[PDB]
Structure formats: C-alpha cells, structure tokens
Specification:
The complex is a heteropentamer of chains A (55), B (232), C (276), D (216) and E (334). Chain B has 232 residues and is mainly beta. Chain B has no helices and 19 strands. Chain B has two domains: 2-118, Sandwich (Immunoglobulin-like); 125-231, Immunoglobulins (Immunoglobulin-like, Sandwich), CATH 2.60.40.10. A six-stranded mixed β-sheet of chain B has the order 2-10-9-4-5-6, with no helix packed on it. Chain C has ten helices and no strands. The chains are: A mainly alpha (55), B mainly beta (232), C mainly alpha (276), D alpha/beta (216), E mainly beta (334). At the B-E interface, loops of B face β5 of E. The complex binds cholesterol (2 copies) and Buspirone (YLX). Residues 6, 9, 13, 64, 242, 245-246, 249-250, 253, 256-257 of chain C line the site of one cholesterol. The PDB classes it as membrane protein. The entry lists the keywords signal transduction, membrane protein. The assembly is pentameric.
Chain lengths: 55, 232, 276, 216, 334
C-alpha cells in the first residue's frame, strides 16, 4: 500500500522533528512540581478531620 | 416551563375551595411543589409544601389542619384544598416550582397565581427598607435580616431573593445566598454572613423595578421578609 | 468423673454447633455473593439451629449432666416449647430448602421470573409457624426433677407427624423428584469422556442426596421412632437411659451437622469463608 | 439535616427505589451473546428470534431474552467480551456450507469457537451452537467432499456423517465440565430455533440449579 | 518505504537514548520516600446493580458521575453519598463516562459507538440527551470534555475524535493508532491529549492541529489507562502487562516503570494525586495500588473491592480518591 507507507513515513518524519530535553531535566521538573505542590496534596499529607470533607 | 393555577374567586367565609395548578413543560413529578400566597397589599407568605413523590408534606402553622396540599404526578397537577376559609385567607396564591439536589435552584419558577377573595420558633426574616427610591444606572444594596443564623454547618446559607415585579409572579434572583439564578443578569448579586444579607444591583434598569423579597429555607418554617419595594 | 466427661462432650458439641451456625450466619451477612434466596434459606436454617444450640442445647446438656430438672416447672414448659419450636423449625427449614431446590430444578421459568427473597422469607416464616403450631399446644390445654414433653397420644401423633414424619415424607418426595429431574438432565446431556462425566454426575447426585437425606434420617428418625412408639408402648416398652440419651442427642447433632450439609459443603460458602 | 438536605435525601431515596425496581426487572432477563463470523447464519437466527451493538428482545414461553449482536464491532473482541461475562448462554453461529468456502471459512469459525469456548470470561458459559445452512451444506456435500476443510476426516461423504463430524469437531474444544455446548442444525427455513434456544436456556438454568445443590 | 520507516524509528529511539542521561529512579534516590499511604474508605456509593466501568469526578470535587452496565449513569453527591441524578442510558453497554468541567453536561458511551451528551441543567428537571455523537465505527472507550461544546472521544476503531457538540460533527479525527484506543487524558491546558491503544502505544495529539505529536511505545500489551501528570509535561499509562509507565512529553521517553512481581493482572485505570507524587492504578486483582510516582514504590493499597477495579479518579482539590469496580461499588478514599 503506497498511501499507507507514505503516511507512516511522513508521520515518523514529523515524529523525529521533536526537540527533546534531557531525561535528567524531566526528572528535575517532576520533582519541582511534586515538592512544589506536596503541601496541597491531601492524599500525600492527609488533611485534619476538621478540614477533611469526608469524615 | 409553565405553571398555571386555577380556582380562586369570591368565597364565603368558613367555606371551602380547591386551588389547582396545571403544570406543563417540565418534569413535574421530580419537583417539590409549594403554595406561596400574598395578600393584595402585603408580602409573600408560604402556605404549604409537597415534596416530589408526595412523601414529605409541610404546612404553614397558620393553615396546618385547614389546608391540604396534594399533587397529581400523572396529571401534572398540584392541588390546595382549603377548608374553613377565614378572612386571612384572601390572597393571590402562587404555585412555586422547586427541586432539591446538590446545586439545585429551588423556587426558580413561579406560577401566575389565582386570587382567592374571602368576605365577612419560626425564623423571623426582616427587611425593614421599603419604597427605596432608585434611578437607572445606580447601585442599590437591599438589606435583609434573620432572627437565626441562616448559615448551616454544611456551608450553605439558605436565603433566597425574589423579585415581585408589578403585576406578575415572583421571580428567583439569588437562590442560596450569593448564588445567581438562571436567566438573571449578573448585575444582581447576593452576599451576607450569619444573619445579615444584602442584595446588590450593580446597574439597575427600569425592569429591575419591583418588590424584592427575602426567604429563608433553613428550618422549614419558610418565612419571607416584608418586601423591599424599589420604585423610579 | 463420669459426670465431667459427659459435661465435656456435651459442651464441646454445643460449642461446635454454635460456632458452625454462627459462622454460617456471619458468612452470609459479611459476603453479598451469599445473599440469595437459596442461601437465605440455608442461613435461616443456620439461625434456627443456632437458636437450638444456644437456647436448648445448654439447658438440655445441664439436664443430662445433673440427671434432673434443677429448674422450676413453668421454665420446664418454656424450654420444652423452645426445644419443640426450634427443632421443628430446623426440620422444616430442611423441607423449605428441599422445596426451593425442587422448584429451581423443575421450574426454571419460575426461578428466573417469580423466585424472590420474599419467597425465602415466606418459607422461613412457614417453618417457624409450624414450629409454634407444634410447640404451643403443650403450653395450652393439650398437655419435678423430670422435664419431659407431653406424652399425650394425640399430641404425640400431631407433634411427631407434623415435625418429622410429614417433613420426612415431603423431603423424600421432593428429593426423589429432584433425583429424577437430575437424572433426566444428565441423560439429556448424554468422546466417551462425556459418558464418564454423566456417570460421575450420577454418582455425585446419589452421594449428595444420600448425605442430605441420610444425615437427616439417621439424626432424627431414631428420636421420632422412639417418640412415636413409647407413648403408645408405655409399660410394654422400656427405654434404656444410655440409648435414650444418645437418641435424643442425635437430633441435636443434626442441628450441629446441618451447616456442614448445606453450607460447609457448598462451594460458594467455602470460597466466602476463604475470603473472610 | 437542612430542609434542602432533607429533600435532597428524599430525592436520593426515590432514585434508589427506582434503581432497585429497574434492577429487579433486569434480573429476569435471559442475556444471550450472539457470535459468529460474517456469512454465518447470525442474521438468519436474529430474524428467526424476531450502530455498534444490536439488541434483540424477545419473549418466549414467559421468558424474556436479550440477544446481544456484536457483529458490527470489528474491533479487538477481548476488550469488550467481558461486558457479556454474565450471559446465560452464547449463541454461536456456524455456516455448515462454509467448509468448501474460503474467506478457510470453517477453520475461521472453528478457531473463533475455540477462542470463545476457552475464554476466561466464558469458562462456565454454555453455548447454543447453531450449524446454519444445513440444506446448502447437504447440496454442497454430495458434490464436494469434506476434505478441503478436514483432511484427517477419513469418513463417509454423506450429509449426516459430515455434519456430525463438523459438530464433533466443534464440540471437541469445550475442555470444560461446567459448560455445555447445545448444537442444532438449521436451514434458514426452519421456525423452531426460538424453541431450540429456549430449551437450551432452560437446560442451562436447570443444570446451574443442580450445580448449586451439589447434584451436577 | 518500509526501510525508510525502520530507519526513522531507529533514529527516534537513538534520539531518545541520547537524551536518557540519568534515569528518573537514579535522580530520585535522594528524596524522602512517602511512608505508607493508608487511605480508608470514607464513602461507599451503592446503587449500581452491575459492573461499573467508568467514573469521573466533578471539578467541584464533590459531584461525580459513574457509568455501569445496569444502563444507569448515576451522579453522586460524594459528600453526603446522595444520588443527585440517575440517568438511564439507551445503550446499557457503557464503558466511558465524562463530566463536563462546567458541570452542565455528562457524556457516556460504549458498544453503541456513540458519545451521548446529557444536559444536567435543563429548565425541565430531568436530565436528557443533548447530543448523540455518531461517527465512530468502534466502541467508545473514553471521552473527555474540552469544554461545554468540545469533547474528545477515543474508540475501538483505532481513532480518536474531537467533536463540536452543538453541530454533533467530528471537528477533528485523530488517526494513527493501529489497535483499539482504550483511554484518553486531556492536558490541563486542554490544547493536547494523550491516548493509549491496544497496540501498546501511547500517542500525543494536538487538539487544534489534529496531529500525532509524539508516540510512546514501552508497554508490551494493550494500554487500558492513560493519565497526564498534573503539570501536563508527563503522563502515565496502564496496560495489561501488569505494569504502569511514566512518559515525559518533552523528553519523549519513558521515565519510570510501576510494576511488582507479585502483580500479574492487568491495569484498568490510572490517576495522579494533585501534587502528582502518587500514581493510583486500578488492577484486575480487585484492588487499587498506590505508587510513589517519583520512586516507583507501592506507597499503599486500596483493597476494598470484591471485583476488578475498573475505574478510579482523584478530585481536583486532591482531597479524595474514588474507585469504581466490577463489584458495582464506588468507594471514596482519604
Ligand atoms: C449422626 C451422624 C453420624 C449422621 C451422619 C450420617 C452419614 C455419616 C451417613 C448417613 C447416610 C450416608 C450416605 C448414604 C448414601 C451415600 C451415597 C453413596 O454413593 C456414597 C456414600 C453415601 C454418601 C453415604 C455416606 C455416609 C452417610 C452420609
Ligand atoms: C458429629 C456428631 C454426629 C457426633 C456424634 C455426637 C453425638 C451423637 C454423641 C457425641 C457425644 C455423645 C454423648 C456422650 C455422653 C453421653 C452421656 C451418657 O450418659 C448418655 C449419652 C450421652 C449424652 C452421649 C449422647 C450422644 C453424643 C452427644
Ligand atoms: O434434654 C432435655 C431437656 C429439655 C428441657 C431443656 C431442653 C430440652 C426437655 C427434654 O425433654 N430433654 C430431653 C431431650 C428432648 C429432645 N427434644 C427434641 C425436640 N422435640 C420435638 N421436636 C419436634 C416435635 C416434638 N418434639 C422435643 C424433644
């Protein structure tokens, strides 16, 4: 199938045309978000029963 | 969505009549239904309540035992059988649509009403302001008082704001304090805390002229304020 | 001591019965895969046998151990009524389970359509109603150191036929019909491995009906043969104490063994006990 | 509770009552998963009983059947096959006159039947096997032998023996003592396949009830 | 052209390997592991009489919609456990349900190949079907509202679609998956969404352009569940190979693998905590397992369902977790 092959090849071409950061920077960003929002995560730190809407 | 009441007219004192309301255009069986009356010169006075499914019925303490509320869900009709019709029972009786679930807006649609003419612990809702003078484009803050904190431990404040424009039915503005009703422009606003509440009209037009009513819905002795008339 | 060993055996039997039926009830309440009409009947039989094991078996054990009725007489009649009520109710739960199974097996359309937990409640109510209908006349006008059921001939017939012999006839008829229906289903089912499986199903049906009916019979039939013969053979027949007590406790052992037949042999109950 | 909270609770209770009533009504349904491969007699038996999923609702002898047709789901079957884990029976359609056709048709249906039989969600689900177009099969079996499909047949080329061999090959993949395969021969002119389904469903219910009592 | 495709794939994997300097596990060995997430069933939502395939939390973190095979779409007041709405579905074969962020609409769909849009706020007090979105030739496995007028759906026809609810038409079709698509997760900015499919691949789609920006292939079995990380720069998939994976959008590579040897069943649902440090996955083994997203440690277990946990959602305020399962129950956890 010419059409399927050309579509897949072009799709892979635009796949490769993606700027990729280092995985170290991705992990650093993941930490930055996780500890930058840990104090507002009730599942990570359970809220006091007074502020817990499911008591 | 319409609610058409029938019945009414002149009735001898101590007599009996049965008001009905022929609902159409909405899921009548799923709405709780009220009667709210209004003497020809006085404010709104809640009569009775029949919940959706008829499992819960409430009456005004001044009518309990005398009046009887019933609904015909297959017929989409709400009834008010009246017995021993006193002189105090002369009023325009409004059939009020009302549904109750999380986030619902009770008292959102009101019927046109019928006039019944008779010949010869409840929370006090106070709005002393009356005949407030207004001009178009100005900001007015209608005040309201409650004898008991309308705020519940769930966080809701059960105060309602209705606009009784001249010659037509009351229309919901703010259903639970600071909640704007559908179809109401966001120049009306509700605010308050505890027992004191204010209805703010940011830039009032000539249509905003009418009588503005409080209503608590916390305990279920539904009481209205003495209407705060706004006039040009 | 000869009294202490008897007390120990009877107490262990009572504890095992209480534990078995309490565990059946707990399994039904704590697992909703067991909350269906058939298991409602099974757990109501467990409830009835728990009532036996906690309100009759301790008192009957004390009566056996002390060889006398150390209590009063109104309480003697009360506990005889409890005994008759609860044992009749257990036997008629066996009958209700048989009837429910018979309807499930011979009336699948009713099983899908009309069979509801309300029918299980009705069956339980009927078993308890028969229990009262058998246990009230002795307290009414159809009646120390000896607490015995009314040996009146008419009441003897009415309480042995209505509590065992009519139930035995019903269970025999219902489970024979169930046997024929199961056999017909197996022959409808019936390369030769299918024939071997039909044979295995045949023996499984035989073994299951044997366990059910044989446990019921070998537990209660000796008691009811004695309880029907002796009131008419008062002087001509003498009951040895050892044989009489063993015969009396065979039915209580039925109250012990009903959870085994109907619950602990059930695959669903076994899985629900594994989960708990 | 507030007055509004009380009325919301009342509405929730009315909703729960309606849900309970609807579930009671739905528990009386005999749910049947209809399966097959294209040119089989799936549509024929649907017409005889009488978008991505087609539901056929019919009542026969006071028993209401919900027949679920998933033919138009040209997807990964395993991703939605568990949606019918609780059917009373699978109604599987095989074209008898598909041994001499290729698109091999009978091997395709045979592999599909194997996958459905031995699927983990259908280990104890009985199957009402329909062998459709038995007249077309009889017309094609006098001319073409049952050797294109089955080389190891080594049997007579008559209609009865060839159809029985096909049915045996289809039943051979059960590999389960709990579930049964109810096989029937249909010709698209017969009007008793509703009765065949009803009889098989009653046998399934009876066998399950016996299995509960320990008598099966 | 197959040779060119193979060369391009080799180039893509080499570019991913080049950027794979330090693994997420290696970098996160110096952060404090969360001790034990011992959440407890605060509420049990009873009323569904069949298997629950989908739940979705409201943005108010109090209302939630659940979809069950009983033909009912139930909206719950998760605080009071009240039933707000019981929506009866025309097709009972529902496998997805979405709650509009405005709260005015819910969507559902399944084997009918339709995304049905339900108006929760009509003048009449009933919930009715505003729009039936037809055009998928396979079952709908997920749907998510972009807003009141836009919804993105995934289908077993290997495609995702973006719909204009008012016109009912596919604004965009998202082709490129070779297997059936099980799940969608919208990005927080809703400019782009990820979809996992049965080809064991997750594809990143640009909603406006309609093109597959990135493709993520780490799983060896069907991806049943996909979820964006709270910042929208990463997402987590859950597949039938008993493993969850975290993929970075910018790194275009798998970061973390969430698997335990004693877990062999597939994964039905994934969700993140509000901070994103917890990855909550629902399994076939009847229980939800809580994962330290940064460290791939089982921080907790949400045992409490008697059948396969088919769906789960974390509230937007992060307060609670709901778990729906095949045992017909929704459990709110804290
Ligand atoms: C008081 C206690 C001892 C009563 C217990 C009675 C038990 C042990 C006896 C009574 C009836 C007997 C069963 C009668 C019928 C059969 C069917 C046969 O194919 C296998 C043996 C089997 C299953 C017997 C097993 C033992 C059995 C169940
Ligand atoms: C599992 C069951 C069937 C095992 C059998 C239990 C029953 C039948 C047996 C076990 C212990 C036995 C008891 C042991 C002690 C005595 C005291 C003796 O003075 C009279 C008999 C009597 C009262 C026996 C009655 C029968 C008995 C209760
Ligand atoms: O041990 C006791 C003591 C009691 C009083 C306390 C507990 C019992 C009194 C007593 O007699 N016996 C000896 C055994 C009686 C056995 N039970 C079996 C059930 N019965 C029955 N069931 C249906 C129909 C008719 N009778 C009555 C006899």
């Amino acid at each position: 199938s010419i059409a399927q092959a050309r579509k897949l090849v072009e799709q892979l071409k635009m796949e490769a045309n993606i700027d990729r950061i280092k995985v170290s920077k991705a992990a650093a960003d993941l930490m930055a978000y996780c500890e930058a929002h840990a104090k507002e995560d009730p599942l990570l730190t359970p809220v006091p029963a007074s502020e817990n809407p499911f008591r | 969505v319409q609610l058409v009441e029938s019945g009414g007219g002149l009735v001898q004192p101590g007599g009996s009549r049965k008001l009905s309301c022929s609902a159409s255009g909405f899921a009548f069986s799923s709405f709780g239904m009220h009667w709210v009356r209004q003497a020809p010169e006085k404010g709104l006075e809640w009569v009775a309540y029949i919940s959706s499914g008829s499992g819960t019925i409430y009456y005004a303490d001044t009518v309990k035992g005398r009046f009887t509320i019933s609904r015909d869900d297959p017929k989409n009709t709400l009834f008010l059988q009246m017995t021993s019709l006193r002189s105090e029972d002369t009023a325009m009786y409004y059939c009020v649509r009302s549904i109750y679930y999380y986030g619902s807006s009770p008292f959102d649609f009101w019927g046109q009403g019928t006039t019944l003419t008779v010949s010869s612990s409840d929370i006090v809702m106070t709005q002393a302001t009356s005949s407030v003078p207004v001009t178009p484009g100005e900001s007015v803050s209608i005040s309201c008082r409650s004898s008991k904190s309308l705020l519940h431990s769930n966080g809701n404040t059960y105060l309602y704001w209705f606009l009784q424009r001249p010659g037509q039915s009351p229309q919901l503005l703010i259903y639970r304090m600071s909640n704007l009703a559908s179809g109401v422009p966001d120049r009306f606003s509700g605010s308050g805390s505890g027992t004191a509440f204010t209805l703010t009209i940011s830039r009032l037009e000539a249509e905003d002229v009418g009588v503005y009513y409080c209503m608590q819905h916390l305990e279920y002795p539904l009481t209205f304020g003495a209407g705060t008339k706004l006039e040009l | 001591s000869y009294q202490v060993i008897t007390s120990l055996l009877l107490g262990t039997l009572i504890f095992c019965a209480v534990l078995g039926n309490a565990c059946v009830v707990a399994a039904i309440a704590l697992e909703r895969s067991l909350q269906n009409v058939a298991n409602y009947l099974i757990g109501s039989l467990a409830v009835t046998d728990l009532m036996v094991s906690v309100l009759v078996l301790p008192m009957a054990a004390l009566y056996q151990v002390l060889n006398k009725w150390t209590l009063g007489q109104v309480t003697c009649d009360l506990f005889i009524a409890l005994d008759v009520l609860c044992c009749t109710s257990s036997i008629w739960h066996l009958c209700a389970i048989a009837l429910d199974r018979y309807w499930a097996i011979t009336d699948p359309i009713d099983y899908v359509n009309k069979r509801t937990p309300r029918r299980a409640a009705a069956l339980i109510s009927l078993t308890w109603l028969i229990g009262f209908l058998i246990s009230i006349p002795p307290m009414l006008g159809w009646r120390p150191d000896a607490c015995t059921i009314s040996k009146d001939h008419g009441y003897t017939i009415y309480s042995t036929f209505g509590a065992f012999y009519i139930p035995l006839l019903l269970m025999l008829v219902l489970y024979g019909r169930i046997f024929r229906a199961a056999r017909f289903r197996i022959r409808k089912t019936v390369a030769e491995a299918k024939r071997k499986m039909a044979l295995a199903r045949e023996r499984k049906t035989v073994k299951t009906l044997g366990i059910i009916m044989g446990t019921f019979i070998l537990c209660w039939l000796p008691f009811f043969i004695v309880a029907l013969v002796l009131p008419f053979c008062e002087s001509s027949c003498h009951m040895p104490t050892l044989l009489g007590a063993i015969i009396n406790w065979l039915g209580y052992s039925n109250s012990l063994l009903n959870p085994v037949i109907y619950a602990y042999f059930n695959k669903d109950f076994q899985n629900a006990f594994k989960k708990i | 509770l507030s007055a509004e909270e009380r009325a919301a609770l009342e509405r929730s209770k009315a909703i729960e009552k309606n849900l309970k009533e609807d579930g009671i009504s739905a528990a009386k349904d005999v749910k049947l998963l209809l399966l097959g491969a294209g040119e089989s007699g799936k549509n024929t038996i649907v017409k005889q009983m009488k978008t991505g999923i087609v539901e056929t609702h019919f009542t026969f002898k006071n028993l209401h059947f919900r027949l679920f047709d998933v033919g138009a789901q040209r997807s990964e079957r395993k991703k939605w096959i568990h949606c019918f884990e609780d059917v009373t029976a699978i109604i599987f359609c095989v074209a008898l006159s598909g041994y001499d056709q290729v698109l091999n048709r009978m091997h395709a249906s045979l592999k599909l039947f194997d996958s459905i039989c031995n699927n983990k969600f259908f280990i104890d689900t009985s199957i009402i096997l329909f062998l459709n177009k038995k007249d077309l099969f009889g017309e094609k079996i006098k001319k073409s032998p049952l050797t294109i499909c089955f080389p190891e047949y080594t049997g007579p080329n008559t209609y009865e023996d060839a159809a029985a061999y096909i049915q045996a090959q289809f039943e051979s993949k059960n590999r389960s003592p709990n579930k049964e395969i109810y096989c029937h021969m249909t010709c698209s002119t017969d009007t008793n396949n509703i009765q065949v389904v009803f009889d098989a469903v009653t046998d399934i219910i009876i066998a399950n009830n016996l299995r509960g009592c320990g008598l099966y | 052209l197959r040779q060119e495709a193979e060369q391009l794939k080799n180039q893509i994997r080499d570019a991913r390997k080049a950027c794979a300097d330090a693994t997420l596990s290696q970098i996160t060995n110096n952060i404090d592991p969360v001790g034990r997430i011992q959440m407890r069933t605060r509420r049990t939502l009873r009323g569904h009489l069949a298997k629950i395939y989908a739940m979705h939390w409201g943005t108010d973190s109090r209302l939630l919609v659940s979809a069950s095979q009983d033909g009912k779409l139930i909206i719950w007041d998760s605080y009071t456990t009240n039933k707000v709405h019981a929506i009866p579905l025309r097709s009972s074969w529902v496998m997805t349900c979405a709650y509009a962020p405005s709260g005015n609409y819910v969507a559902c769909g399944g084997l009918d190949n339709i995304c049905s849009i339900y108006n929760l706020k009509t003048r009449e007090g009933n919930v009715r079907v505003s729009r039936e979105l037809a055009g998928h030739t396979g079952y709908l496995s997920c749907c998510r509202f972009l807003d009141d007028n836009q919804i993105v759906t995934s289908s077993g026809d290997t495609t995702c679609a973006l719909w204009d609810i008012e016109t009912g038409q596919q604004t965009t079709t998202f082709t490129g998956h070779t297997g059936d698509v099980m799940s969608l997760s919208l990005a927080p900015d809703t400019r782009l969404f990820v979809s996992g499919a049965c080809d064991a691949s997750a594809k990143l789609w640009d909603v406006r352009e309609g093109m597959c920006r990135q493709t993520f292939t780490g799983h060896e079995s069907d991806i049943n569940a996909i979820c964006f990380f709270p910042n929208g720069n990463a997402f987590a998939t859950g597949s039938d190979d008993a493993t969850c994976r975290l993929f970075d959008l910018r790194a275009d590579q798998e970061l973390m693998t969430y698997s335990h040897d004693n877990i062999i069943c597939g994964i039905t649902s994934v969700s993140f905590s509000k901070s994103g440090r917890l990855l909550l996955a629902g399994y076939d083994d009847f229980n939800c397992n809580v994962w330290d997203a940064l460290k791939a440690d089982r921080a907790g277990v949400l045992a409490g369902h008697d059948n396969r946990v088919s769906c789960l959602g974390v509230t937007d305020d992060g307060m609670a977790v709901a778990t729906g399962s095949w045992d017909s129950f929704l459990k709110i956890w804290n």
